[PDB]
């Protein structure tokens, strides 16, 4: 218990709660009463977080192709830059992957249907990238060990 | 001195030095945070051009100022938004903030000050506004309830 | 009330040395246009009114204006298209999800009052008046 994070849901502007299911699937859900929609938001750097499903203990990650997946182990793909757009929304993007030449970030995002999107199809200034933490409580976390 | 094509005027090391000096007045324990309720005072207390003189609410609410739980704002976010107000908006700006965060991280051994974003100044403003309405409505209902009660008299 | 404020009020009162319809004229000279019903309420909270009672009536009216403005501005924050209307659904969402959240029973009551014509739209100025009527 050295890190000061939060237990929280992540509400998507698209009208869903982010969800990480037992089977490892990521998506948005209308079910405001789901154990999974719970996340540990863990600070691993200045405006850097890890996002972990409380029920599954899996970390959200983005691979080199822009695809979001779940990881049992904490890796550099599990770190998200946290930023706010227009002072109203929170955006999460890859720390290590980026639009080559474009210099544009790759974001966590849901589409109108609540489906997870390819990181490079999500733009910071678009509804898909727009989230709002719905915090339950403050929590202390042992720091995750970084793997490869 | 640093100046861009969009800058109202240039900034110098003295401005950043002045920034910390004022910061320490509001954050004497170097927690790296101030409470949002003193942000307006902090902004007004800086020297020009970083200063945002009162009334300064509109300017502040228009800046990207993320708030950690509860209602606490990091010095780095404040530092960046205030300097961007002066230097002006630019493409590189967004990328420059990422680099600044990285440099701050490399220089800072005190990791305890890293906390995730929970809300924003604008969201807080909406919570406050909603409460004004909620209080008005409860006052209204209570006045009504007592009124009905007193009728029997 | 400040001496500056009392001065202005004595000035306006002296110009009409007071009847009930005289108050209407005094209010007009202070830039107000209260309805007769509004005038009656001001009088009731206190057909001839003494000065010191006028001051009390003015002090109260300025307090009321402040609270009316505070609530109106609070509603303005949520009328993001600036048309004076907020949909009942949005009002319901804001009231139950932000601040000191209203219960289902409280919010049902708010919508019952705030959307009389039942068109799914709230004229918030109307509702502001309702909540400041007393
Ligand atoms: Mg409207
Ligand atoms: Mg109608
Ligand atoms: Mg209506």
From Swiss-Prot, chain A:
Cellular component terms (Gene Ontology): axon; cytoplasm; cytosol; dendrite; filopodium; growth cone; intercalated disc; lateral plasma membrane
Maturation and modification: May be phosphorylated.
GO BP, sorted A to Z: branching morphogenesis of a nerve; cell-cell signaling; cerebral cortex cell migration; establishment of neuroblast polarity; hippocampus development; inhibitory synapse assembly; learning; MAPK cascade
Subcellular location: Cell projection, Filopodium; Cell projection, Growth cone; Cell projection, Dendrite; Cell membrane, Sarcolemma
GO molecular function annotations of the record: beta-tubulin binding; growth factor activity; microtubule binding; sodium channel regulator activity; transmembrane transporter binding
Phosphoserine carried by residues: 145
Predominant subcellular localization, coarse grouping: other
Tissue: Ubiquitously expressed. Predominantly expressed in the nervous system.
Role of this protein: Microtubule-binding protein which directly binds tubulin and is involved in both polymerization and stabilization of microtubules. Through its action on microtubules, may participate in the refinement of axons by negatively regulating axonal and leading processes branching. Plays a crucial role in neuron polarization and migration in the cerebral cortex and the hippocampus. Regulates voltage-gated sodium channel transport and function. May also play a role in MAPK signaling.
Protein name from the UniProt record: Fibroblast growth factor 13
Provenance organism: Homo sapiens
Designated gene of the protein: FGF13
Swiss-Prot record, chain B:
Protein localization: Cell membrane; Cytoplasm, Perinuclear region; Cell membrane, Sarcolemma, T-tubule; Cell junction
PTM comment, free text: Ubiquitinated by NEDD4L; which promotes its endocytosis. Does not seem to be ubiquitinated by NEDD4 or WWP2.
Residue numbers on the Cytoplasmic membrane side: 1-153
Tissue specificity statement from the Swiss-Prot or TrEMBL entry: Found in jejunal circular smooth muscle cells (at protein level). Expressed in human atrial and ventricular cardiac muscle but not in adult skeletal muscle, brain, myometrium, liver, or spleen. Isoform 4 is expressed in brain.
Extent of the signal sequence: none
IQ domain sequence ranges: 126-153
Outcome of mutating residue 20 to C: In LQT3; also in a family associating LQT syndrome and atrial fibrillation; slows the onset of activation, but does not cause a marked negative shift in the voltage dependence of inactivation or affect the kinetics of the recovery from inactivation; increases the expression of sustained Na(+) channel activity and promotes entrance into an intermediate or slowly developing inactivated state
Region spans: Interaction with FGF13: 64-126
Known outcome of mutating residue 75 to S: In BRGDA1; decreased I(Na) density; shift of the steady-state inactivation towards negative potentials
Impact noted for substituting residue 86 to I: In BRGDA1; uncertain significance
Misc. remarks from the entry: Na(+) channels in mammalian cardiac membrane have functional properties quite distinct from Na(+) channels in nerve and skeletal muscle.
Assembly and oligomerization: Cannot form the same regulatory interactions with beta subunits as other Navs do. Interacts with the PDZ domain of the syntrophin SNTA1, SNTB1 and SNTB2. Interacts with NEDD4, NEDD4L, WWP2 and GPD1L. Interacts with CALM. Interacts with FGF13; the interaction is direct and FGF13 may regulate SNC5A density at membranes and function. May also interact with FGF12 and FGF14. Interacts with TMEM233. Interacts with the spider Jingzhaotoxin-I (AC P83974, AC B1P1B7, AC B1P1B8). Interacts with ANK3. Interacts with PKP2 (via N-terminus).
UniProtKB/Swiss-Prot annotation, chain C:
Modified-residue entries (Phosphothreonine), positions: 35, 96
Residue ranges, annotated region (Necessary and sufficient for interaction with PCP4): 62-134
Note: This protein has four functional calcium-binding sites.
Gene source species: Homo sapiens (Human)
Subunit: Homotetramer. Interacts with MYO1C, MYO5A and RRAD. Interacts with MYO10. Interacts with CEP97, CCP110, TTN/titin and SRY. Interacts with USP6; the interaction is calcium dependent. Interacts with CDK5RAP2. Interacts with SCN5A. Interacts with RYR1. Interacts with FCHO1. Interacts with MIP in a 1:2 stoichiometry; the interaction with the cytoplasmic domains from two MIP subunits promotes MIP water channel closure. Interacts with ORAI1; this may play a role in the regulation of ORAI1-mediated calcium transport. Interacts with IQCF1. Interacts with SYT7.
Stored Gene3D superfamilies: EF-hand
Chain positions found as Phosphotyrosine: 85, 124
Boundaries of every EF-hand domain copy: 4-33, 34-64, 66-101, 102-134
UniProt modified residues of type N6,N6,N6-trimethyllysine: 101
Effect of residue 126 to V: In LQT14; loss-of-function variant causing impaired negative regulation of high voltage-gated calcium channel activity; impaired regulation of cardiac muscle cell action potential; decreased calcium ion binding
Binding site for Ca(2+) 3: 79, 81, 83, 85, 90
Residues spanning the signal sequence: none
Membership in a protein family: Belongs to the calmodulin family.
The UniProt record lists the keyword Transferase: no
Record protein name field: Calmodulin-1
Record's comment describing the protein's domains: The N-terminal and C-terminal lobes of CALM bind to the C-terminus of KCNQ1 in a clamp-like conformation. Binding of CALM C-terminus to KCNQ1 is calcium-independent but is essential for assembly of the structure. Binding of CALM N-terminus to KCNQ1 is calcium-dependent and regulates electrophysiological activity of the channel. The C-lobe interacts with KCNN4 channels in a calcium-independent manner, whereas the N-lobe interacts with the S4-S5 linker of KCNN4 in a calcium-dependent manner playing a role as calcium sensor and gating the channel.
Broad class of the protein's primary localization: cytoplasm
Posttranslational mods: Ubiquitination results in a strongly decreased activity. Phosphorylation results in a decreased activity.
Residues annotated as binding Ca(2+) 1: 17, 22
Residues modified to Phosphoserine: 67, 87
